């Protein structure tokens, strides 16, 4: 049976620890690939990680790692939550050094882009077979999500883009089912940008909370019916979500166009809240460290700096990473809505740590009826390792 | 289907080795968590061992465990009963430095307790993914059983403190439908003091034998009613079953109050055998090592001293640790009445042995129709470990 | 559903290698349990080989051993046949270093015996739970098959003995239905020695080809009908089967009566084929080296030298041990008997070879329709390992 | 319920990469077995990848393999594609050092010939069973695909050769039902040479694209229909698709006999298109080196030397080695045609590198309706290896 997420986000007063794998710490002596983006997504019985892996395993010679991130060797695999991305517990899912999952009710899809920089090929995967394949249509790193794609009544959708990291790329809508492509579009966003979306359903729609690369330190917005019409522009907010990124009090905000005069980025998440929004980001301003999640009246609809909320995650102490959105399932949260959740991802290694290697771990967080406690579940692993 | 465990308790006249999972012998060489609490339940299908890792691995740096206890890489974990706490076959739980599970004939339901001292968060999970959240109440170290919760017809039902290890501190009831809390209860018991219950079903209530650690050296007991009314004492045999204690011959017992000079205390359990019980505790007055179950007559509703059996299943020259009670399902032991049995902690390491780390392994047994043999099923490990 | 085994057992010529495990070349570096008795037991979906662990891994100080063999440590795990003994494919089935277990069609049937020699207990577990207990009856090493027992129509059959490894013991056969203790018998052998049994389904009835460790260098038979009537006796044929024994030219067979001077023995098995027999033996008449399958004209029911067949398994270069039967449930053969196999244990370490250690890997081999040319299919480990 | 596959084979422009399992790279540190031929095969629920495994792990003395190929310890085993060979996630098929793997819909049926070269016997699984045997009819080193047979509404089809290396051999298709031989048939072909067939099921019939080892750099073409009438021949292009073989401006093609003065060979496929063929090769003449597919105009039906498509998988710099077919079942590719893939070995260490041991690992590919850019996912792993 296909899932309906067509219900409303939960509206949610903080967020409560799901689920921390302590893969780096276990992977010291156990069998631990090396890892990036550990995403997480769920069908209507359970919810896994999906990771990178460059076929490489914590402590052999191996994780060096001088080895180029878009590899022949990189590969799309997945655990159940919680489970470190170890050998043995590992499912296969695509050859990927780029990656987008999610289920439909019925089956697992993926896409993974691997190939050349100049033509790379992106294969959806549908109940663990090739269905269909997009090619590069700008032959410049055809690239993905990096986190759940969103199922809404049986058909899949995600976005894609293919240009420079920096100036104009283009951007791609992606419809499916069964793991076909039934539909795409071309966004148009000129002077904007677009990448490794976070997304989640909401109101029978999907709703991305973005990356720009480009210029902007605030995060882009989609919104995508099921037809493939969209509304496109930035998170309204009077605060910057990406990294880096500077001062809040030397930012406005905007709905339609890129604020800061800042190259690059990171991956990371909004969730609508009715008018308001969630927004996810590093407690550093220009390193991938600490992780905070704010809570922004009428955040999502207007230029507001009205902090509602403020949930520290992982601690300025230490290092984080990539962040991305998924939803629980009724079928499994039991409720009439979909209960907003987020993984954050803790970066070991180089270049911030004498390493001659690079991996993270996981703590993954859902929406919840109340407000919640500072910590820091941070990753926790004592570097160097052997070697 | 839900499970009723309305049965009556069955009447036994000893207990038969079920489990014995040697986690540390072969964590000499396998990849095995540093655990504690090797704690025990049951769905209808099968009886699964939970406990708390570190994300850490015997036999690996990490081990180290100078590491406090209440760390934010702690996590509740699960493999089948008789399985060691190794990787490859551990199902992960919840984010946890303490926690009770359980299952209501459809899904498992777990609690685990984690974030600060000062406002720690309970994160009820049910089917694997969060369902509901319980913040501390009293602002000192949220805690619960540390064994099998207790579900009948499908609520489930659980203790919890919140205080000092100390002096008087706070206790409540919780009750449980599909994950979400349905009911709660302060537990009257001023003077007195309940921790890390181990409790059962029996003729449609809830019975638990606690852990005193203010002043007393009997075990408190509670039986609690599907509404939450409960009557709250202490087991009333004259015999002293916490750790530390003094003699037996030194003691008399209460059923409604504290009696030894104590403080501190360990985990452990009873059953209630009619007007009988079979009461749990180290052969040792002082330390966590050899342990003995003993059946005393009239033991549950008066002050007696009646041994009418005894049973060493681990001897006075080796360590043991904590224990709690479980029971078997109908569905699985085919009886007419609920089979009692509890597990035994092994506790290996630090402090009583030179090793930089602490783990523990477990010996599990059941209820049945007969008198057993003294035996001493032992952990088993070769200290100290190549470190 | 409860499988009928009441099918004739398959007439064969020769029988095919079904599985090799390999568990020590792979525990040269895997991490693989220490083992003993790897004996195989088949449900109506799956064959499982069962074997007892000291939970030590191979190459770990650990495996040392000088340690007892019915020691608190030992219990009975399984894996698939064919696998290896590794710890993280290996399902926990009883404590134990005495052992049977067997499929009634429903339900998986194990026993395992443990506790002192002097009063030992075998708890029987049916679904992977206690369900029922025997204590010892005589007070000198209860123990039983090491092999396969035998579930007709949802009766489940076995063989236990209690009295001295030598002279005269007491022998009993067992009853059981969902695990529970339905009918036992004692059986009346003087002068006669019954352990280690190898039993099989034909025509309705449970057959056994036993181990006489007093004075036979002949098998002992048992044929045990639904109620528990039995005839008992010594496999007929003028050939002997026992591990030590004499020449053939210097044996006379006995259908009532052990014939060799001999103490001491191995466990072994063998086939009725109508009249003929099967029988399994070691090359060697002194050692548990090589193993060889012979047909008997008439070996049975008569005391018949007519050698119908010969087929070797284990060349007499290389190390053995015990050996068992099953059979193949008709819902897997497809066919309308019961196809006979057996397994050999080759044992490698202590005491033939200098290791501290001690453990066996296993050849499975079933019926077949065909003349199947001699072989060697033995261990094929390197030792000593590195320790 | 039994599959059709009596569809036509997709008509297919390139082809899409569906799994990578890296098992060297891994094998470095985790216990990976040291494998050959990793080929694929697929039930209506899955793709599993076999291998065959001396019993010995990568980086461990038993790696050594001066051991010969066919030894007794050589075992088929499989996992879900795209996970390594390590041991905790293989399953067991058969005792074998020659394969074939197929699904009928219901069960997996397999076959495994070992035993002496002289007598070898292939024992036929059937759903993890032994059902059927067939000795060696000429003597001479009994042998089959080393890729996956072909089932066609519940009949299953293979090929095996018994004789000389070079010389004339004899050649069988043998047929089965629930693993029970139904049929045979001896391939009339003198002056011909058949070994180690790839096949695939197209339009009701079995056809097949096989290695001669005597004189032939064209690869032998078998069309087996379901009575067991065949025609034979060669694949008719005008293009060598053997390793070693001569330049494509030295040969011309022949439909019916081989062509280039070339003993030995290298297993590999073809698939038909219509009238035209997609062929696989090493992109090296001498070597198993590089990999490449090519679609050749006509070149099933004719002598075709035209180039329709090419498309790299591996490049020159890298080792390649065996190759075979297999088809994605309707059940999975959703499609109303057979999609055809491939599998391709790439072997790294002995000869052509220093190490004491040899394994491989593989890339695995699908047809797809589009040009698929050119690539090398090659093995990857650093060599020598600690050893
Ligand atoms: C560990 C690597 C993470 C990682 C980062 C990152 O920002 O660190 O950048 C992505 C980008 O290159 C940019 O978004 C610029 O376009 C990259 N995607 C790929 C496949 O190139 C991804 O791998
Ligand atoms: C290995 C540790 C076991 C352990 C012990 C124990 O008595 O040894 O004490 C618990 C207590 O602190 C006390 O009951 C006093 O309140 C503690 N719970 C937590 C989480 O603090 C638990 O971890
Ligand atoms: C590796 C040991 C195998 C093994 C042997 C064996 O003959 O080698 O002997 C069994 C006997 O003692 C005898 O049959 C004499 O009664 C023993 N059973 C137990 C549990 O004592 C069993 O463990
Ligand atoms: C790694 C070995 C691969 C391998 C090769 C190969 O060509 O390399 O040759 C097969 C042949 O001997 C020939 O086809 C000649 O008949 C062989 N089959 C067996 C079992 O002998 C198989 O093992
Ligand atoms: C960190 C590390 O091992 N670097 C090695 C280096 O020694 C070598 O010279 C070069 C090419 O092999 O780059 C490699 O990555
Ligand atoms: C037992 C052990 O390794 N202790 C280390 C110690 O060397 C170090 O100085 C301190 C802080 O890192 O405490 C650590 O636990
Ligand atoms: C083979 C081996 O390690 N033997 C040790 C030996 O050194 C020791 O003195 C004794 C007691 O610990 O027996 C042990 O088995
Ligand atoms: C590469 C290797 O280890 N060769 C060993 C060699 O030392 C030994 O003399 C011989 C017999 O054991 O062949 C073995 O394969
Ligand atoms: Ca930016
Ligand atoms: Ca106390
Ligand atoms: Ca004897
Ligand atoms: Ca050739």
Same mark, same amino acid.
């Given at each position: 049976?296909?899932?309906?997420?067509?219900?409303?986000?939960?509206?949610?007063?903080?967020?409560?620890?799901?689920?921390?794998?302590?893969?780096?710490?276990?992977?010291?002596?156990?069998?631990?690939?090396?890892?990036?983006?550990?995403?997480?997504?769920?069908?209507?019985?359970?919810?896994?990680?999906?990771?990178?892996?460059?076929?490489?395993?914590?402590?052999?010679?191996?994780?060096?790692?001088?080895?180029?991130?878009?590899?022949?060797?990189?590969?799309?695999?997945?655990?159940?939550?919680?489970?470190?991305?170890?050998?043995?517990?590992?499912?296969?899912?695509?050859?990927?050094?780029?990656?987008?999952?999610?289920?439909?009710?019925?089956?697992?899809?993926? /896409?993974? &882009?691997?190939? !050349? $920089?100049?033509?790379?090929?992106?294969?959806?995967?549908?109940? #663990?077979? *090739?269905? @269909?394949?997009?090619?590069?249509?700008?032959?410049?790193?055809?690239?993905?999500?990096?986190?759940?794609?969103?199922?809404?009544?049986?058909?899949?959708?995600?976005?894609?883009?293919?240009?420079?990291?920096?100036?104009?790329?283009?951007?791609?809508?992606?419809?499916?089912?069964?793991?076909?492509?039934?539909?795409?579009?071309?966004?148009?966003?000129?002077?904007?940008?677009?990448?490794?979306?976070?997304?989640?359903?909401?109101?029978?729609?999907?709703?991305?909370?973005?990356?720009?690369?480009?210029?902007?330190?605030?995060?882009? /917005?989609? &919104?995508?019916? !099921? $037809?493939?019409?969209?509304?496109?522009?930035?998170?309204?907010? #009077?605060? *910057?979500? @990406?990294?880096?990124?500077?001062?809040?009090?030397?930012?406005?905000?905007?709905?339609?166009?890129?604020?800061?005069?800042?190259?690059?980025?990171?991956?990371?998440?909004?969730?609508?809240?009715?008018?308001?929004?969630?927004?996810?980001?590093?407690?550093?301003?220009?390193?991938?460290?600490?992780?905070?999640?704010?809570?922004?009246?009428?955040?999502?609809?207007?230029?507001?700096?009205?902090?509602?909320?403020?949930?520290?995650?992982?601690?300025?102490?230490?290092?984080?990473?990539?962040?991305?959105?998924?939803?629980?399932?009724?079928?499994?949260?039991?409720?009439?809505?979909?209960?907003?959740?987020?993984?954050?991802?803790?970066?070991?290694?180089?270049?911030?740590?004498?390493?001659?290697?690079?991996?993270?771990?996981?703590?993954?967080?859902?929406?919840?009826?109340?407000?919640?406690?500072?910590?820091?579940?941070?990753?926790?692993?004592?570097?160097?390792?052997?070697?």
């Amino acid at each position: 049976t296909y899932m309906n997420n067509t219900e409303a986000i939960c509206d949610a007063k903080g967020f409560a620890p799901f689920s921390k794998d302590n893969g780096i710490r276990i992977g010291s002596r156990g069998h631990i690939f090396v890892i990036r983006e550990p995403f997480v997504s769920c069908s209507p019985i359970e919810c896994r990680t999906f990771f990178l892996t460059q076929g490489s395993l914590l402590n052999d010679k191996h994780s060096n790692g001088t080895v180029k991130d878009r590899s022949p060797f990189r590969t799309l695999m997945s655990v159940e939550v919680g489970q470190s991305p170890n050998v043995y517990q590992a499912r296969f899912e695509a050859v990927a050094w780029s990656a987008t999952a999610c289920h439909d009710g019925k089956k697992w899809m993926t /896409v993974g &882009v691997t190939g !050349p $920089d100049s033509k790379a090929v992106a294969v959806i995967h549908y109940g #663990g077979v *090739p269905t @269909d394949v997009v090619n590069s249509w700008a032959g410049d790193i055809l690239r993905t999500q990096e986190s759940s794609c969103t199922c809404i009544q049986g058909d899949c959708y995600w976005v894609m883009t293919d240009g420079p990291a920096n100036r104009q790329a283009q951007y791609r809508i992606y419809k499916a089912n069964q793991g076909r492509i039934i539909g795409q579009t071309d966004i148009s966003f000129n002077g904007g940008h677009i990448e490794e979306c976070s997304c989640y359903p909401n109101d029978g729609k999907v709703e991305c909370v973005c990356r720009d690369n480009w210029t902007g330190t605030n995060r882009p /917005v989609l &919104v995508i019916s !099921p $037809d493939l019409s969209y509304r496109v522009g930035y998170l309204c907010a #009077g605060i *910057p979500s @990406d990294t880096p990124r500077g001062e809040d009090t030397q930012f406005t905000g905007s709905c339609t166009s890129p604020m800061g005069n800042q190259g690059y980025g990171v991956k990371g998440f909004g969730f609508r809240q009715g008018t308001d929004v969630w927004m996810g980001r590093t407690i550093s301003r220009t390193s991938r460290s600490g992780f905070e999640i704010l809570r922004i009246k009428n955040g999502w609809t207007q230029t507001s700096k009205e902090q509602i909320r403020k949930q520290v995650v992982v601690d300025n102490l230490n290092w984080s990473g990539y962040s991305g959105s998924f939803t629980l399932p009724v079928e499994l949260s039991g409720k009439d809505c979909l209960v907003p959740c987020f993984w954050v991802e803790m970066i070991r290694g180089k270049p911030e740590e004498k390493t001659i290697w690079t991996s993270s771990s996981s703590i993954v967080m859902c929406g919840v009826d109340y407000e919640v406690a500072d910590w820091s579940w941070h990753d926790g692993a004592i570097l160097p390792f052997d070697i």
